[PDB]
Amino acid sequence: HHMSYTWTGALITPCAAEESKLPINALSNSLLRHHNMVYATTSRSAGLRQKKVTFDRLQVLDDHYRDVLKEMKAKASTVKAKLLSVEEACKLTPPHSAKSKFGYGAKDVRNLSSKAVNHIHSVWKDLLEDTVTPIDTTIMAKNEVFCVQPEGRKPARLIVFPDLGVRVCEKMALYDVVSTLPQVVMGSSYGFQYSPGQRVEFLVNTWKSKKNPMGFSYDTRCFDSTVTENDIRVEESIYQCCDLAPEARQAIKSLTERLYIGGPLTNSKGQNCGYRRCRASGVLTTSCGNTLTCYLKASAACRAAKLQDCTMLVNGDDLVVICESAGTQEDAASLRVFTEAMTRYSAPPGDPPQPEYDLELITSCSSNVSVAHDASGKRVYYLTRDPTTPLARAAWETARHTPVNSWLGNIIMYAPTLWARMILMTHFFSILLAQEQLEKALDCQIYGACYSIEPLDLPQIIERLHGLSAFSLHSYSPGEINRVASCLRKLGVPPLRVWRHRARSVRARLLSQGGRAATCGKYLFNWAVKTKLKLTPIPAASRLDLSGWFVAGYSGGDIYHS
Ligand SMILES: [Zn+2]
Numbered sequence: 001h002h003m004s005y006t007w008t009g010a011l012i013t014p015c016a017a018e019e020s021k022l023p024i025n026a027l028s029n030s031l032l033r034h035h036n037m038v039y040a041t042t043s044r045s046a047g048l049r050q051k052k053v054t055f056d057r058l059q060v061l062d063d064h065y066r067d068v069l070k071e072m073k074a075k076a077s078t079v080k081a082k083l084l085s086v087e088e089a090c091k092l093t094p095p096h097s098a099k100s101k102f103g104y105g106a107k108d109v110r111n112l113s114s115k116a117v118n119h120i121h122s123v124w125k126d127l128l129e130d131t132v133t134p135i136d137t138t139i140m141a142k143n144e145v146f147c148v149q150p151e152g153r154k155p156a157r158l159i160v161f162p163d164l165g166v167r168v169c170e171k172m173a174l175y176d177v178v179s180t181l182p183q184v185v186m187g188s189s190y191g192f193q194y195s196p197g198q199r200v201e202f203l204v205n206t207w208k209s210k211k212n213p214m215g216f217s218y219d220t221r222c223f224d225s226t227v228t229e230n231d232i233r234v235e236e237s238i239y240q241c242c243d244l245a246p247e248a249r250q251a252i253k254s255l256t257e258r259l260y261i262g263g264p265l266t267n268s269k270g271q272n273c274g275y276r277r278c279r280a281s282g283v284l285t286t287s288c289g290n291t292l293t294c295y296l297k298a299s300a301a302c303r304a305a306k307l308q309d310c311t312m313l314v315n316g317d318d319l320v321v322i323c324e325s326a327g328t329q330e331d332a333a334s335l336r337v338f339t340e341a342m343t344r345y346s347a348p349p350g351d352p353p354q355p356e357y358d359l360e361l362i363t364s365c366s367s368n369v370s371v372a373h374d375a376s377g378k379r380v381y382y383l384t385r386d387p388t389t390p391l392a393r394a395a396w397e398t399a400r401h402t403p404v405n406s407w408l409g410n411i412i413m414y415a416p417t418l419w420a421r422m423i424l425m426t427h428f429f430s431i432l433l434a435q436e437q438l439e440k441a442l443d444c445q446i447y448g449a450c451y452s453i454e455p456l457d458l459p460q461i462i463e464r465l466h467g468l469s470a471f472s473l474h475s476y477s478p479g480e481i482n483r484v485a486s487c488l489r490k491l492g493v494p495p496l497r498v499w500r501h502r503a504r505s506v507r508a509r510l511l512s513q514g515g516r517a518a519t520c521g522k523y524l525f526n527w528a529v530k531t532k533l534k535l536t537p538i539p540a541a542s543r544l545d546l547s548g549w550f551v552a553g554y555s556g557g558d559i560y561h562s
Pocket of ligand 1: 001002
């Protein structure tokens with residue numbers, strides 16, 4: 001047997017008390033009334049998750065697989081990557097990253113304190129000398145917020161991560177590799193090179209490039225658990241194709257043998273929970289490995305299915321394919337063959353894929369293309385998503401400070417959307433005004449990495465990522481309007497006419513503050529008035545350093561880019 005996990009029966013334990021019920025304050029009702037619809041996952045459901053993620057993996061690897069792999073390795077061989085110094089790697093550590101078990105924390109690391117640096121060096125030396133001993137990991141249940149979907153409650157997802165010292169060593173060995181290799185190997189198919197607008201451009205251009213377009217998303221069941229020892233060694237063989245220093249080569253070999261392939265699982269109480277033989281969700285290579293492995297399996301599956309003129313877009317375990325239609329029956333047939341190949345590769349689907357002939361109806365990375373109209377009346381395509389989870393998370397953040405501010409990330413990613421503009425902007429700017437906290441920088445995450453963002457910089461950030469049109473879109477699609485309306489009914493969110501009324505108040509209060517606050521009032525809330533101000537390029541926008549923002553995925557990888 002080739003089991004993803006083996007377990008001792010020891011429990012996955014929490015670090016602090018965990019809340020599952022939505023916390024309520026005086027502001028909660030202004031956002032939503034159906035409080036019992038929002039929950040957070042806790043370690044209490046960890047056993048249910050363990051059951052779901054534990055299975056035997058079988059893998060049959062054919063000529064299509066090896067052909068694509070050869071191609072990937074040929075591209076990888078053009079990459080030159082560098083070792084990061086200790087200091088460079090230390091500066092990439094989030095200020096609140098989990099402290100080391102060895103007597104120092106993330107602040108000590110960021111400050112280059114002697115004890116941290118010395119220990120990191122000792123971890124590094126040990127990686128070079130020893131390429132066999134499994135490195136310890138901690139297993140935790142993630143506390144994440146969702147809306148109930150009777151389609152009831154998700155069990156908590158699991159996070160598996162090594163000690164802080166090792167994580168700094170992972171950056172040193174592989175940060176440059178995971179940041180540069182995937183776009184070289186996968187080209188335009190690598191999803192994390194795109195801002196949301198650029199992703200939309202690629203998808204729309206790809207769709208228009210087909211005579212008779214068909215598209216489909218592919219949902220792998222428990223992707224991390226599907227990743228085998230084979231997959232992880234194949235990933236390492238790809239990394240090693242790069243032009244690397246011998247010390248980097250040795251560290252990558254060692255991290256592969258000792259950490260990436262598998263290792264002991266330890267709870268928060270120091271007890272042995274069992275043993276992992278699949279992808280660790282909390283390592284630097286999580287996003288890059290998943291993306292490469294998904295792309296490899298899917299590219300080979302496309303060949304097996306004989307899909308005509310197909311283009312892929314891959315973000316970790318998330319996959320969308322757009323190809324040439326051969327008719328509805330022939331397409332259904334192709335997807336069945338595609339699915340069979342993926343399954344043989346260890347990657348069977350949760351929901352079976354279905355052919356889609358309307359681009360707007362294809363969901364990938366929880367998102368879809370939709371269309372609205374700019375100030376001139378021109379059709380504009382933009383990225384959107386079902387607002388349920390963003391709004392459930394905003395409900396939580398209304399009553400509780402959290403390490404990651406999802407509302408702020410969601411405004412950045414989904415600025416052009418009806419719901420981010422009318423609800424998220426209005427609600428959160430009301431709150432920040434009330435506490436006079438417009439100037440206070442908040443942590444958020446973009447493609448897995450951590451940023452400290454000042455809400456007063458939102459107009460310039462949005463202009464840079466989405467263009468000026470994000471401040472003037474109107475006439476959204478009836479499909480998008482219905483979806484938003486359905487979500488508001490479900491969660492008990494006030495109707496859009498109430499948000500319009502509130503936004504006029506927010507806009508006025510922001511304008512009354514002048515400076516950056518007034519720019520926010522002017523640009524972010526121009527949709528809320530009949531008396532529309534003239535929106536011109538903001539000078540500060542061109543000065544914003546937004547490099548590294550949409551380059552690569554770092555989910556689980558403990559990266560701070562501020
Ligand atoms: Zn065997």
